Amino acid sequence: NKVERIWGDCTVRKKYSHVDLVVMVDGFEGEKGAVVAGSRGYFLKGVLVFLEQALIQYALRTLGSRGYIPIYTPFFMRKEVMQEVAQLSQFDEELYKVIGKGSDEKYLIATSEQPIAALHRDEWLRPEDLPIKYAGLSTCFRQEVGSHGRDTRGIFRVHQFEKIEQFVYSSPHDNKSWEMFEEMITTAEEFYQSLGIPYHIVNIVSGSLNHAASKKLDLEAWFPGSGAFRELVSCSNCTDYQARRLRIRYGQTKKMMDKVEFVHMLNATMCATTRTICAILENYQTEKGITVPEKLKEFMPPGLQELIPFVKPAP
Amino acid sequence: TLVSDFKQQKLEQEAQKNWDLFYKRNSTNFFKDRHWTTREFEELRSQKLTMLEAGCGVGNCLFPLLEEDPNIFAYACDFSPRAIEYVKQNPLYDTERCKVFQCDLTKDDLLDHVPPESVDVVMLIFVLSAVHPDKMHLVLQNIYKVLKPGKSVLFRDYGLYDHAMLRFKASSKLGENFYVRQDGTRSYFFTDDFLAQLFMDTGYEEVVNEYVFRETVNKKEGLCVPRVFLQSKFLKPPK
Amino acid sequence: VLDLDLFRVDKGGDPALIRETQEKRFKDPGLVDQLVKADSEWRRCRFRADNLNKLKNLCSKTIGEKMKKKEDDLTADALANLKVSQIKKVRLLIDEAILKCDAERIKLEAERFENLREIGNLLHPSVPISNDEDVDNKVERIWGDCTVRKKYSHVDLVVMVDGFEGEKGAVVAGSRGYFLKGVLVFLEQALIQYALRTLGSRGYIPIYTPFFMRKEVMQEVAQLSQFDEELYKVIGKGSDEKYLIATSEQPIAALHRDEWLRPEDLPIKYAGLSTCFRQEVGSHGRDTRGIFRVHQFEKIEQFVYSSPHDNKSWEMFEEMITTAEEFYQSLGIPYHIVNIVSGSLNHAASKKLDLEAWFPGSGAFRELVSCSNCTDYQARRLRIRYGQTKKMMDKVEFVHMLNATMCATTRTICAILENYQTEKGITVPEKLKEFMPPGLQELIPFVKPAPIE
RNA sequence: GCAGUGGUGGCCGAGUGGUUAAGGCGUCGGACUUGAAAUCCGAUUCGCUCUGCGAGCGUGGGUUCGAAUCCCACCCACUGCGC
Numbered sequence A: 001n002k003v004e005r006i007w008g009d010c011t012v013r014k015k016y017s018h019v020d021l022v023v024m025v026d027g028f029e030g031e032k033g034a035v036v037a038g039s040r041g042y043f044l045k046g047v048l049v050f051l052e053q054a055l056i057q058y059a060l061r062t063l064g065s066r067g068y069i070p071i072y073t074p075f076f077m078r079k080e081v082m083q084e085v086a087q088l089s090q091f092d093e094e095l096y097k098v099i100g101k102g103s104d105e106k107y108l109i110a111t112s113e114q115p116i117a118a119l120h121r122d123e124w125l126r127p128e129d130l131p132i133k134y135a136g137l138s139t140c141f142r143q144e145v146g147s148h149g150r151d152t153r154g155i156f157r158v159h160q161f162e163k164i165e166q167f168v169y170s171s172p173h174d175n176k177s178w179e180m181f182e183e184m185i186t187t188a189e190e191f192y193q194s195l196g197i198p199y200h201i202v203n204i205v206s207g208s209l210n211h212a213a214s215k216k217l218d219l220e221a222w223f224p225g226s227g228a229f230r231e232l233v234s235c236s237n238c239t240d241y242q243a244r245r246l247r248i249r250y251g252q253t254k255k256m257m258d259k260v261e262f263v264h265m266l267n268a269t270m271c272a273t274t275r276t277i278c279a280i281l282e283n284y285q286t287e288k289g290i291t292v293p294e295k296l297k298e299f300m301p302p303g304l305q306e307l308i309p310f311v312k313p314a315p
Numbered sequence B: 001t002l003v004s005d006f007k008q009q010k011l012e013q014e015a016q017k018n019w020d021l022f023y024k025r026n027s028t029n030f031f032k033d034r035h036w037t038t039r040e041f042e043e044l045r046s047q048k049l050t051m052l053e054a055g056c057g058v059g060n061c062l063f064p065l066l067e068e069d070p071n072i073f074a075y076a077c078d079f080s081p082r083a084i085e086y087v088k089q090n091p092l093y094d095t096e097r098c099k100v101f102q103c104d105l106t107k108d109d110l111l112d113h114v115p116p117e118s119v120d121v122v123m124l125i126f127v128l129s130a131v132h133p134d135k136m137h138l139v140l141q142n143i144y145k146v147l148k149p150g151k152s153v154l155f156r157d158y159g160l161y162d163h164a165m166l167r168f169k170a171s172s173k174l175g176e177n178f179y180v181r182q183d184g185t186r187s188y189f190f191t192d193d194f195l196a197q198l199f200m201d202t203g204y205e206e207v208v209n210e211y212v213f214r215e216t217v218n219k220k221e222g223l224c225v226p227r228v229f230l231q232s233k234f235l236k237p238p239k
Numbered sequence C: 001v002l003d004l005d006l007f008r009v010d011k012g013g014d015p016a017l018i019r020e021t022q023e024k025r026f027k028d029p030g031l032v033d034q035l036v037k038a039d040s041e042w043r044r045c046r047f048r049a050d051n052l053n054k055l056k057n058l059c060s061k062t063i064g065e066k067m068k069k070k071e072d073d074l075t076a077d078a079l080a081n082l083k084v085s086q087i088k089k090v091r092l093l094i095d096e097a098i099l100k101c102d103a104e105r106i107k108l109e110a111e112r113f114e115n116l117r118e119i120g121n122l123l124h125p126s127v128p129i130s131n132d133e134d135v136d137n138k139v140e141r142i143w144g145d146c147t148v149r150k151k152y153s154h155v156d157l158v159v160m161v162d163g164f165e166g167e168k169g170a171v172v173a174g175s176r177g178y179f180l181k182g183v184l185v186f187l188e189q190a191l192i193q194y195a196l197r198t199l200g201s202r203g204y205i206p207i208y209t210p211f212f213m214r215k216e217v218m219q220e221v222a223q224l225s226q227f228d229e230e231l232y233k234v235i236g237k238g239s240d241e242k243y244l245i246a247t248s249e250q251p252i253a254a255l256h257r258d259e260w261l262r263p264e265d266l267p268i269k270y271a272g273l274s275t276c277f278r279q280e281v282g283s284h285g286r287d288t289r290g291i292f293r294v295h296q297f298e299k300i301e302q303f304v305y306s307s308p309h310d311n312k313s314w315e316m317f318e319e320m321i322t323t324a325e326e327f328y329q330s331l332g333i334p335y336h337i338v339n340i341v342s343g344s345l346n347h348a349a350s351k352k353l354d355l356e357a358w359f360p361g362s363g364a365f366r367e368l369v370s371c372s373n374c375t376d377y378q379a380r381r382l383r384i385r386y387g388q389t390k391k392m393m394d395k396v397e398f399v400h401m402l403n404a405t406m407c408a409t410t411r412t413i414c415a416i417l418e419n420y421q422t423e424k425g426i427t428v429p430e431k432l433k434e435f436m437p438p439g440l441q442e443l444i445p446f447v448k449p450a451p452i453e
Numbered sequence D: 001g002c003a004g005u006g007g008u009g010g011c012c013g014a015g016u017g018g019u020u021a022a023g024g025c026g027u028c029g030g031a032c033u034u035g036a037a038a039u040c041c042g043a044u045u046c047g048c049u050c051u052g053c054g055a056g057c058g059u060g061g062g063u064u065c066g067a068a069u070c071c072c073a074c075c076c077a078c079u080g081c082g083c
């Protein structure tokens, strides 16, 4: 994996990992959550609900200032539509199935990129409006929560989490898709530089790419209490792989004896709230609590605008 | 408001069972011997003085005054079998000075075990408060027939507005001045007028009937509290 | 469920009162009589099963003693005079009797329980006894102007602001699916921020709940009808006993499940935040379409565990309805408070108040808040005890549990849109301008024409 | 999702095929002591026709006369993997 650029200090180390910090601030309920929902179920409470909401507010305003349109999506999708945006591997391994009455065939979404992709299916887009940018906001549901040590427990790998996505439909001409790809990863990078999270950008190897992706960049943040890099953002350019399966066409008119061109589609995570909360807690821990990042103070309630205090001991 | 009227009936029909299970769970370790008895009453001071102890418990009221003065014969009454067995298994027990027997002072009669007009002093120490307010005169009449016509009856029990009355939560109230403990035993808090007009209705004559005030203090918790017991002596009319 | 001793008349119970309550709720009496007979039979069957168990235990003890000393009117001494083989012969008869008694007892238990789960909570004496909700629902209070009329209903207003995608939503998710987009995502988020901040300042603990509840736990917090036809079922790899929650009150109720709560700190207040998934969406006209009745929506809930003594849960009930009232008064939305009739309460509720907001573009009253006091009906099922210590003789007391919707985001958005429409756009409520982006702090402009026009 | 170890009462923690589920800790009430207490005595899972008997040691089952102890399944943790 080719590391492309570094930002911040990715070697400093601090006392606790997120697995202890979420309990020390009293914002996590894992045992009762596993009683209610089962393995990995969790309640998030108190100061951590306010912090997650502050993250959503800050991400939405950051993306809205850039020209993205916020969009709240449905959380389940008809199977006939989900096939066109997902792979077979995903359905058995990662997609929950929703059953109504009379035994429908809907699936809970794994990411808001899946409903946003189907928002323009079977359409002829006007080339004039093509940099179409959406900021998806939704709850994602994954089945795979396999653990790899203590530092992967807590709220790091869960079945249910809120995520803010970047989704762009782009012209397929003049290398504009790749310029937009660079712009998307730069937007994510600036989001994490303004939060003060150190990271490096990684160029993912061709072996670990999904079928649609023609290139992928991950943003991996440094976790000083865990001593590891963890992936927080994934940026991908799928070109016209999904556009032609969904039949999203570039021009509004077809030429006689000339095949149509499809738009280019790019998606990039902006903020998965649980993982970003983990990174914030690990990077801003002090001896008396967690310092609130300077950019989230305006979105926090009074009383939680300078410090999230420790109220319990570390397990 | 008050305790369920169904529950108060269950408390009345299970009074003896509740006192018996008290002696089962607490053994003879709950109450402590009363050494203040001889000093408090002008009787019992230093010939053959036959005595009846109504509600004898496991002792704790007759064994002190009985090892103190060695010319006293004692009758012991209690409706709980466990208390009688504990009194008998006491090493200080000897049949030549004591005659213990079970007798429900409201249902049973005392003449089945003691001779009429024989006892010269009978003691009621924290026994009448465990009896239902509407069956107390039953006890007074049951003991009226065994008292020598010049003898007397000694009485100490809870009085009105004592602290123990004030600690009771409202869910433990059966009626005016009538409460129930966690274990099922009950507590009636007497007033001078109530006790006077309860003894007068059964043929007694009042001699002394006045409150006794004390206090309880736990230094470690720094708790000092008022206590109000009612002490009295009633006398059976000579002629 | 109700306390079984309310039906035992040999205890302090009275089934006649349960009959009166079951009549006032316009439910089936005689369910009480079926319950009483099933329970009285179950008690005798339990007595017999305990006696058979005692005999089996005594046989095993005697066998053990015979073996270690190196050797059904039965008594202790009676068995002490048998060889081991004979005691085992007796044990076989004991086994047969125990097995048939166990079958009978399991049947009686299931029957008594299926009769008990269909008897409703006792009613607060303030409930209006009736079965006609449209006629006898008592209006308690009114706030604001509930007769003004305005041009568009929410069904048009959500499109004129370009914040709603219905056709594409139904293509993606099916009937009633929708994309919320643009200015209405910011407005929903503003509502969530404002409601969470208000509830947090009142002393509620914000809590983000899981959306999948297990079946074993959902049975204890839900009803037969809901659990049957109202809940979506989730299935993962394997099979799958999980059910998408219909409200955040369901997981929060199971948060202190099977606990002995200290009386100090008893008034625990929770501001639940989750997405709710309801399967029933019926359209009674045009003004109930749009985002008014949907399958998926975010809801902020009040949930309070209270002391069962000293009328504390009813004071808490008034406090919760007052919190919701003040919320909607700061949002500037007119409403009236209605007391629901006996026939419309669900089984757990002793009383239910509803806040019904006036929709000036639709000309109707629509229910936004629903505040219920379910007393110990649910705590007894979940075994949430009021003290930490059990008394010597008294029975265990359970906490009361109240819940009240604070804000369902879609319906409140509809109310705000209908009440703040002008000719050029939607005026932003003064209490939501803190939480809106710059540029969306004074007006949400109309950018499309009305679909009716 | 595998392939290992585990799961005791409000909590900690013993438990050895014949417990009274020990010892603590926490909580709750009762106190009548004249030798009062800088404390003592108790209770503290569910059920029944309650001074007793029955059930309960993650949940269900099996073997045994008898299981909290042995076996199996499932669930949930922790340690290693797959992802």
Ligand SMILES: Nc1ncnc2c1ncn2[C@@H]1O[C@H](CSCC[C@H](N)C(=O)O)[C@@H](O)[C@H]1O
Binding pocket: B019, B031, B034, B054, B055, B056, B057, B058, B059, B060, B061, B077, B078, B079, B080, B083, B103, B104, B105, B106, B124, B125, B126, B127, B130, B131
């Ligand atoms: N109606 C009644 N007839 C006989 N005994 C009774 C009674 N009501 C209560 N008792 C007995 O009175 C006792 C009160 S405890 C007090 C015992 C004694 N007075 C002492 O100083 O130690 C109880 O043991 C109870 O068994």
Ligand SMILES: [Mg+2]
Binding pocket: none
């Ligand atoms: Mg434990």
Ligand SMILES: [Mg+2]
Binding pocket: none
């Ligand atoms: Mg113990």
Ligand SMILES: [Mg+2]
Binding pocket: none
């Ligand atoms: Mg078991």
